[PDB]
């Protein structure tokens, strides 16, 4: 029954003839029980991913890769599936690889495909797996790990794309137990220009887009608050250069974090003394960094 497809992928299929075979495969997956999916198992899943990477390598047939994504969604739509997608090496990585501004629909299907893994309860820290894998692609071609998620938040993009961006961002924020983490990557985002564009993502009136912001803003705010609660204390104690150096030496000294901090400081200390508006100047950077860590 199932074997018929496993061979079809291995039998060196190609543009157009592949597409067809892939379509039928999806539809067969969806319109079947759970036990028929098992028989496709790891072996079948395997071959699907092989074609993906092989198809990525090459540089008419975006439609060809897309169907393998849809196949996966269909395949993963159950216990067995996702689990066995998770056991793979390049599984989660290739889903990520499918994201991009150039093929709106594929990214759409790739994003929510990952998002549903994040908010998975029992395989703890799935958001960590996703974020790791998200990183690994940013070197093959050497651009930043988030620029996909921001590319699909411009002028031109399908308003359905935008929902799937911020939709992923939430799944890559909510289950994260460490507050430091969430503000970290949220600041990563806004460094690329999320705050420059997030203005426009309220101007658009939508039903499914604004159940997203109503969980994002809910977070970006319940973090900001809780963070002051910690900063406010630091406004009290670290009142003193002494209190600063005291902490700098104890925590930012013999931890790889040092040469970074050292640099930050070196940059800060650049504006020579006798600059009349130096108070004003440092005031300016004050708000810069403050916007960066808080807003």
């Amino acid at each position: 029954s199932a074997m018929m497809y496993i061979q079809e992928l291995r039998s060196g299929l190609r543009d157009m003839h592949l597409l067809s075979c892939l379509e039928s495969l999806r539809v067969s997956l969806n319109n079947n029980p759970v036990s028929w999916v098992q028989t496709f198992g790891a072996e079948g899943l395997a071959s699907l991913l092989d074609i993906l990477k092989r198809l990525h390598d090459e540089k008419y047939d975006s439609r060809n890769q897309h169907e393998i994504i849809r196949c996966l969604k269909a395949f993963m739509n159950n216990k067995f599936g996702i689990k066995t997608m998770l056991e793979t090496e390049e599984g989660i990585l290739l889903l990520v690889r499918a994201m991009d501004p150039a093929v709106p629909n594929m990214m759409i299907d790739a994003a929510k495909l990952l998002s549903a893994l994040c908010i998975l309860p029992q395989p703890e820290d799935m958001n960590e797996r996703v974020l790791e894998a998200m990183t690994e692609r940013a070197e093959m071609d050497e651009v930043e790990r988030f620029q996909p998620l921001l590319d699909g938040l411009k002028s031109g993009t399908s308003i359905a794309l935008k929902v799937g961006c911020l939709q992923l961002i939430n799944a890559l924020i909510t289950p994260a137990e460490e507050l430091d983490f969430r503000v970290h990557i949220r600041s990563e985002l806004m460094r690329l220009g999320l705050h420059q564009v997030l203005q426009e993502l309220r101007e658009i009136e939508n039903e499914d887009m604004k159940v997203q912001l109503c969980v994002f803003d809910e977070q970006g705010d319940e973090d900001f608050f809780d963070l002051k609660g910690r900063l406010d204390d630091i406004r009290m104690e670290m009142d003193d250069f002494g209190e600063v150096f005291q902490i700098i030496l104890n925590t930012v000294k013999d931890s790889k974090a040092e040469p970074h901090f050292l640099s930050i400081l070196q940059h800060l200390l650049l504006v020579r003394n006798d600059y009349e508006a130096r108070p004003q100047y440092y005031k300016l950077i004050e708000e810069c960094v403050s916007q960066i860590v808080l807003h």
């Binding site: 969604k73 993963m76 739509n77 159950n78 216990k79 599936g81 996702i82 929510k112 998002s115 549903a116 908010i119 998975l120 929902v163 939709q167 939430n170 799944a171 909510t174 499914d208 159940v211 997203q212 969980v215």
Partner: peptide
């Protein structure tokens, strides 16, 4: 059919 339940409860997200 499972990951659909996780998908709708995503746009209309009560899985938070």
């Amino acid at each position: 059919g499972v990951m659909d339940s996780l998908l709708e409860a995503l746009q209309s997200g009560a899985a938070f």
